Every structure is written in structure tokens, then in C-alpha cells.
Amino acid sequence: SANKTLERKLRLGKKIRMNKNIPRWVILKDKLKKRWNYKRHHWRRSHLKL
Amino acid sequence: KEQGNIRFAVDCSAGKDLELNLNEFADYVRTHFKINNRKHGVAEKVACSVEGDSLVIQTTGYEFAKRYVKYLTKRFLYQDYQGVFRVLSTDKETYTLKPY
Amino acid sequence: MADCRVTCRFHSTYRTRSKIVRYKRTPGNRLTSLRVKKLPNAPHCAETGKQIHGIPRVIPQHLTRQQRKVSRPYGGKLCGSALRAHILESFLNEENQ
Amino acid sequence: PNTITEENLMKMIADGRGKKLVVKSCSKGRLQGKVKLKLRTAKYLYTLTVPNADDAKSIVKGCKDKVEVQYVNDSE
Amino acid sequence: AKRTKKVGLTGKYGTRYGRAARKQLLKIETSQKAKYTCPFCAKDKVRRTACGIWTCRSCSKTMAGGAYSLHTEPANAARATIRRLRLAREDAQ
RNA sequence: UACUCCGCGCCCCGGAGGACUGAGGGGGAGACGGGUUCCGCGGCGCCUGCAUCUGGCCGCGGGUGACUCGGGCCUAAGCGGC
RNA sequence: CGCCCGCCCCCCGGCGACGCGCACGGGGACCGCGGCGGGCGGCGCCCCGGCCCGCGAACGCCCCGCAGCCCCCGGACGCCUUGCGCGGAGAGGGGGGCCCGGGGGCGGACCCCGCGCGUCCCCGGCCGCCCCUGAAAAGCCGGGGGGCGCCGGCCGCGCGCCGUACCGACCGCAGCAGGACUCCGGGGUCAGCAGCCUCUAGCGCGGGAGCGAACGCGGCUCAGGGAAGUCGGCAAGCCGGCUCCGUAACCUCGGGAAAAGGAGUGGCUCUGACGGCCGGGUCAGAACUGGAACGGACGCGGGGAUCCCGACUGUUUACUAG
Ligand SMILES: [K+]
Ligand SMILES: [Mg+2]
Ligand SMILES: [Mg+2]
Ligand SMILES: [Mg+2]
Ligand SMILES: [Mg+2]
Ligand SMILES: [Mg+2]
Ligand SMILES: [Mg+2]
Ligand SMILES: [Mg+2]
Ligand SMILES: [Mg+2]
Ligand SMILES: [Mg+2]
Ligand SMILES: [Mg+2]
Ligand SMILES: [Mg+2]
Ligand SMILES: [Mg+2]
Ligand SMILES: [Mg+2]
Ligand SMILES: [Mg+2]
Ligand SMILES: [Mg+2]
Ligand SMILES: [Mg+2]
Ligand SMILES: [Mg+2]
Ligand code: NA
Ligand code: NA
Numbered sequence: 001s002a003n004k005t006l007e008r009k010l011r012l013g014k015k016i017r018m019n020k021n022i023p024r025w026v027i028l029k030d031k032l033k034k035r036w037n038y039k040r041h042h043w044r045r046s047h048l049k050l
Numbered sequence: 051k052e053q054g055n056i057r058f059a060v061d062c063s064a065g066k067d068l069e070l071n072l073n074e075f076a077d078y079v080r081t082h083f084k085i086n087n088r089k090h091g092v093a094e095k096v097a098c099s100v101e102g103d104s105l106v107i108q109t110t111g112y113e114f115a116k117r118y119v120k121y122l123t124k125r126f127l128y129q130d131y132q133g134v135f136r137v138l139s140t141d142k143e144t145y146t147l148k149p150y
Numbered sequence: 151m152a153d154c155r156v157t158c159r160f161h162s163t164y165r166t167r168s169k170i171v172r173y174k175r176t177p178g179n180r181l182t183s184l185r186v187k188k189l190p191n192a193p194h195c196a197e198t199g200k201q202i203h204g205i206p207r208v209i210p211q212h213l214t215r216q217q218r219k220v221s222r223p224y225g226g227k228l229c230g231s232a233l234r235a236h237i238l239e240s241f242l243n244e245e246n247q
Numbered sequence: 248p249n250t251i252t253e254e255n256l257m258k259m260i261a262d263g264r265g266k267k268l269v270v271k272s273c274s275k276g277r278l279q280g281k282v283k284l285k286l287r288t289a290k291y292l293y294t295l296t297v298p299n300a301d302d303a304k305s306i307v308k309g310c311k312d313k314v315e316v317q318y319v320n321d322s323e
Numbered sequence: 324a325k326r327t328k329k330v331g332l333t334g335k336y337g338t339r340y341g342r343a344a345r346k347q348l349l350k351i352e353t354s355q356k357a358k359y360t361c362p363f364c365a366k367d368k369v370r371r372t373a374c375g376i377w378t379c380r381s382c383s384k385t386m387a388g389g390a391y392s393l394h395t396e397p398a399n400a401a402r403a404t405i406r407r408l409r410l411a412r413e414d415a416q
Numbered sequence: 417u418a419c420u421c422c423g424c425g426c427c428c429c430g431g432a433g434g435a436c437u438g439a440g441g442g443g444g445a446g447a448c449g450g451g452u453u454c455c456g457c458g459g460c461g462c463c464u465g466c467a468u469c470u471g472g473c474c475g476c477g478g479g480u481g482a483c484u485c486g487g488g489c490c491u492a493a494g495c496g497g498c
Numbered sequence: 499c500g501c502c503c504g505c506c507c508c509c510c511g512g513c514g515a516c517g518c519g520c521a522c523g524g525g526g527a528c529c530g531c532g533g534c535g536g537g538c539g540g541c542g543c544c545c546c547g548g549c550c551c552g553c554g555a556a557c558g559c560c561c562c563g564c565a566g567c568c569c570c571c572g573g574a575c576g577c578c579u580u581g582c583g584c585g586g587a588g589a590g591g592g593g594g595g596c597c598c599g600g601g602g603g604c605g606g607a608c609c610c611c612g613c614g615c616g617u618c619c620c621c622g623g624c625c626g627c628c629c630c631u632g633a634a635a636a637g638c639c640g641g642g643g644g645g646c647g648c649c650g651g652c653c654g655c656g657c658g659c660c661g662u663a664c665c666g667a668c669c670g671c672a673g674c675a676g677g678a679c680u681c682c683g684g685g686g687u688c689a690g691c692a693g694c695c696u697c698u699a700g701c702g703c704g705g706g707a708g709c710g711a712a713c714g715c716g717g718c719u720c721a722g723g724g725a726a727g728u729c730g731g732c733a734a735g736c737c738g739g740c741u742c743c744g745u746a747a748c749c750u751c752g753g754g755a756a757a758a759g760g761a762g763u764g765g766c767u768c769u770g771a772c773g774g775c776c777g778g779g780u781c782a783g784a785a786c787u788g789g790a791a792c793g794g795a796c797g798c799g800g801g802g803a804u805c806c807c808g809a810c811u812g813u814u815u816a817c818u819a820g
Binding site for chain 7: 138
């Protein structure tokens, strides 16, 4: 909604900042086999419950 | 009160190069003017005369709006010279003719 | 213009008695909304429920001190008619009593 | 905004209460060649319309250098 | 009685409740819609406000009375009895 | 109820034509719920049950300003404490 | 009652602060008509007959403001509403005061001019209704008594914390013909916010081409007959707007009742009636004239005679029983 508490707003803020891929220089520095971050979410499919 | 003493002119000097003579224009206005949807009694109060630069319509004791003068001019130009010119206000009594 | 429909001016769209507007034309040829504030009642008599003369229908905070007073001994609490009865009643009673 | 009378115009200018004075020459319609004097005060903007242009020169000359002055004189 | 023969004000009920109820309502409603003389100013300006509350449209004096009518016969009998018993006591103190 | 011609491709964009929703709107805005879906630039590996040069899809950067609008105060039905 | 503004304590009050309704009146916005100024379109014939534009806020000061309520003189079959209602506890008349979410003028800001029916919203005074009477508190103010004393004008500063993008992008396993609260609401036809066409705004949605068999789904017409069909008139069909004429048995006297059943309705050219110191529509009558046609689409009762059950309006097995 457009009328939220700051407490709910801060927990949703962290979810957005975390929805990122694995950086390219990290994949090769650590010699990673699996190159996708499976803790990502999509707004049309998820239920954050926050 | 319809005191008349109204003046209206159409500056046709801008179309001087083309072949639009003010006498045929004056006759058209005289022949097809209408007062109260009736063509009689018009020589009594409506007079249009060729001047140096424009046709001048002088009326005594009668009233009407510039729109009518615009309507008559456009009908004449429809007879000949269709597609060219335009009729634009330039003062509180006169008009003008400028190409598209 | 061919369309004169507006949009709500308040936080929500529920039309309660404190959410009434009227429409006026602005200098930019636009139709605007203005609140219609509630008009409070002027003070009413204590003995009777009638309205007391001389005080306008505004909240007392926005009036000067002179504008919310009446120049009489009980002014603003009771009407002139009710004051006569109390004066007559007290005098006639204390004379006999 | 409120209207002001002539006598308490240069009085206000006397108590140094005006912050600016604007002169504008109106020459169309019911404002026929008359001028409006607009004085900016701490609380209100006060305006006077002298009935003739001549009266403007005298009053403004009666407060020259006492309050900063503008001119408009729109002619369009 | 130009419009009805007998229903009177109970014509608002159509044909919906029966004869006994309609007769009783005729009596009661006629009584409760009436105008009564004010005991304080002798004018016929008393009207019902609630079940047992009657108000005068002239003097603005409010009274407690019966439902459907300003006075009831038991109340008149009681007032007369009180008035009688009040005088007998005041003669002998 | 429904698209067509040309640029250019039945689906994107433009111009021209032909239609529709029909002021209880397939219009313009809020509450709740959602949580970045919003904007610009680029793209077609996935998805867009046909296609796609399109996109609520993918990548990179951005974006929400209050003395006067709402909440913070009051008390309702209630709840808690004693 | 007015005009230029004292605070604290105790007590007495007020404001905040309140139902529903058919009507009637006022204001605003919308809408339409005519005039004047500016711009445009089309033009086989007509065309001063078409289209678009012509704007004015909060706030300050001065005037006006119907109904309502009050003051003075004086002493009555009168005043007055659509409806009512009021008067010796003081009417009419004459002269005044108060309130009125409003209007006008001047500022804000160098304002095209007149007129009118209706629609929506708000307000007003009445009347009606109830074995139904239609919140509270913070906060603010007044009066009485007591105790105290500049309290206003000008000029300066200041006003912390949090929300704020966008969406029917929400829930139904999905970009699911379901479900999902509220606000603003033009033109024509019309009783109408119904049905039908449309300005503004928005927009062509699980893809296309060919062919024109059976059969299905959704529609249309049909000679003569007219329920013979079938458990059963199921389905479909008939009727239907408005005006006038005419309406039975029975009855709880209120109904039955739109009972039943008849006739008219287009276009054009005219006539009369109803107001005000120009406007408006409606109602009534006549001539002429169209394939014996006119509620020409749309919208919109089939009726009657009886028996059983339950008096009636209402409620019910969400997903087979109303
Ligand atoms: K915002
Ligand atoms: Mg006063
Ligand atoms: Mg349509
Ligand atoms: Mg929005
Ligand atoms: Mg987007
Ligand atoms: Mg994405
Ligand atoms: Mg506020
Ligand atoms: Mg705040
Ligand atoms: Mg926003
Ligand atoms: Mg779920
Ligand atoms: Mg859906
Ligand atoms: Mg048979
Ligand atoms: Mg058979
Ligand atoms: Mg059937
Ligand atoms: Mg039943
Ligand atoms: Mg039923
Ligand atoms: Mg069931
Ligand atoms: Mg069923
Ligand atoms: Na187009
Ligand atoms: Na409709």
C-alpha cells in the first residue's frame, strides 16, 4: 500500500537490495561451478510475507 | 439602434499580380447581398464601391457583422481562384488577402 | 472543454459530512475543488434552547474578545426575557420572605 | 491584498514601513490611462489607483529616495 | 367521510391484518393523533412527542402523561383521592 | 462485433481509411493488497500456449522533498492494568 | 444591542454534537439559446442554416441577504402557506436589532454581452413518523463570585518525527469469461441514471488462410390444420407505450381492477387556451395528404373459470430440495 509503517518499509528495503546476481569477478576468483544465486525472487511469483 | 454609418474594406492589393479586378467583385456583392433573407431593398442601405486598394461597403442606418463580408468574399473566390488566398482580419473594419 | 469530470482531493474518497466540496473555475480555465467547512452553532440559551443574539457562527477561538460578549449582566448565558423573570422573582420573593 | 487611501500612503512611507513601490500605467478599458501604485508591506500588499496619470508623478516625487521604486508602463 | 365509509385512518393498511386489529387501531390512533387542551394555558396545542411525553406548541411546557392519550382515568381517580386525603389531614394537623 | 493500404512486418511505430468501449466506461483517480512491477538506454538466451524488431521478460543506470494533506492526539464498541 | 480584545481559582453553562421522509424555496456547478469578435471545413444545388475559442482562485475591506428570532408605539375577525400556521401570555400597521456554509463592488488582476428549462450537490423554513427518539471525549469559549494587573500595536525570528513511485501488477497453483470497497458523470430519442446511436478520453487482447459436406451450438421464415404431440402446452409464440370509452361475481368494504373488452396514434398547414410588465412549454380542435400506414427500430401484462395447502411482507439445505 501507500500508507505503511517505517518498520515494514525497512524490511522490504533489504529484500530489494539482496536480489542480485553473483558478480563476474567473484565467480572466477572462487572457481565457482554453479553461477546462479537461488535466493533471488520475482515479484510476479513470490510471497514475501513482510 | 441601427444607425449604420458602418465601414468595411477588403485589402486586395496583396493579390495585385494575379488577375482579380475589383469591379467584378463589386458587382457580385451588389447582386447577391441579402437583407432579412430578402434581396430587395438593398440598394437603399448597402453601397459597395471600388476604391484605390479595396472594395468599401458603406451602409446607412443598417447593421451587420464582419462575418458576412468574410462569407461573401469566400464565395467569390470559390467562383475562381479556388485553393489560393485566405481572408484574415487586420483591423477593426478591414480584412486582407494573403496566399497559403 | 468537452469533459468536466474531476478527481478526489482528500486522502480517501469516502464522502462523509466533513468531506464536501464545491466547484469553481480558475484563471487557467480549469475546474477546481474547494472544501465546504462545517458551520458551528452559535451559543444557545441555558433556560431555553433558543439562540443568543449578537454572536456570529464561528468557533470562538477565531473571534476577538469583544465579538463574543454581550453588554448585559448575564450576557451570553441567558436572553433578556429570561433575565427579567429572575430579577422579578428574586425581588418579589425576598420582599415577602 | 487591500486598498489604501492617499493620505496613509506617504504616511506609511514616513514610518519606513514600505519595502518597495511599483508604478504601473493602465491604458485599456475601465482602467483608462490611469496608474496603480502597489506598495509592499510586511503583512499586506497595498494598492492605490490615482484617478489621473499626473497625480502619480507628484506623490511618487513626494516619496522619492524614501522607498525604492519600479516602473512597468506596459504598452501591449 | 367522502372517501371511505368506515376504515378511516386505517386505510393505510390495505387488506392486510384483519378486522379486530384494524378496529382497535382505529380507536387508539385516533386518540394518539389528537390535540389536547394545555392545563397551564387553556389552548388546544398539546401533542405527543414519545410514548408518555406530551408537549405544548404554545408555551413549550412538557408533561408526563399516558401513552396514546394525555390523561388516563386511573390517574384522575388517583389525583382525586390524593386531594381528598390531603384536606382531611390539614384540618386536624 | 474488426481490420485494411503504404513506409515495413496480420500482432511494434507513423500517416490515411474503417470500427468499437458508450459518462453504473475497456475513461480519469483513491482505500486495501502487491513490493520496484515505475523512468531512460540497450537486448532477444528464457517467458510473451502463433510470431515478435514488442513487453509487467533480461542487463545497466536512475527515481518518492510538507508549519497548512494524512499518521502522531481524542474518545466509541472493546482491550489491558489494579 | 453596538463599538476599540485583561488573567488565575471555585461553581453554572455553551460549542464540539448528530434520525428518516414526500414536497416547497434559495445558491453553486453543469447544460442550452441569441448577439458580437477571432479561426476552420466542405461546397453537384442551397447556405448570415456546420464546427472550434472567447478564462478569473484562496484571502482583505464596504454594501446587500428571503424565511426565522427579538425591541418600541399602540390596542384588534385580522395576517398568511403548495401544505400549514399565528394572535389579548399582545395580531395588523409603522419604525428598528440579530443570525444566515451566499451574492455584488474594489483589491488579488489592464474582467465579450444578454436570456432560459432541466440535472446534480448543498443549504432553509415547515409538516409527517416511531411499544424504534436517532455517540462520546480531547479541545475551545462565556457567565457569577473572589483574587489579582498594563494588554494590545509595530518589528523580528521559528514550526521537530513518520507516509508519499506505480498497479485492479490483488486472491483463486497462471498474464484464469470467477471474486474484489469508494469518488467525478456531457448530447440525442424518452417518463427515465432504462434500451439504441454518439462528443471527450482510451483502444483492436490463446495467431492466421481456404472451403462453403454431414452433424452440432446460437438465430430466421414457413401452405392447410391448430395440442391430434407429451407424464405434463416443456419450448416457442400471442399481449404490451400513451389517450378515450367500458368494467362482473365475491369481499375482512380497504379491494377484486391494467378485471373482462373496444377505439385512436404518421407527415404537413393552421386555430384556441394558460403568464409578465418578452418567456414558456403543455393541453385541446380542424383541413389536406401518403400500398387501408404510423408505440413503424428499441423498449414493453396473454386472459378467464375452479379445487388443495399456507393468512399476508419475510427466511432456508454456499455445490442436485425455495
Ligand atoms: K507524492
Ligand atoms: Mg455581535
Ligand atoms: Mg457503439
Ligand atoms: Mg495513481
Ligand atoms: Mg514499463
Ligand atoms: Mg526484471
Ligand atoms: Mg490537518
Ligand atoms: Mg501533521
Ligand atoms: Mg502519486
Ligand atoms: Mg495461496
Ligand atoms: Mg480477472
Ligand atoms: Mg393428447
Ligand atoms: Mg399420445
Ligand atoms: Mg413456458
Ligand atoms: Mg407464505
Ligand atoms: Mg414471498
Ligand atoms: Mg443446494
Ligand atoms: Mg434450487
Ligand atoms: Na487512425
Ligand atoms: Na443507457
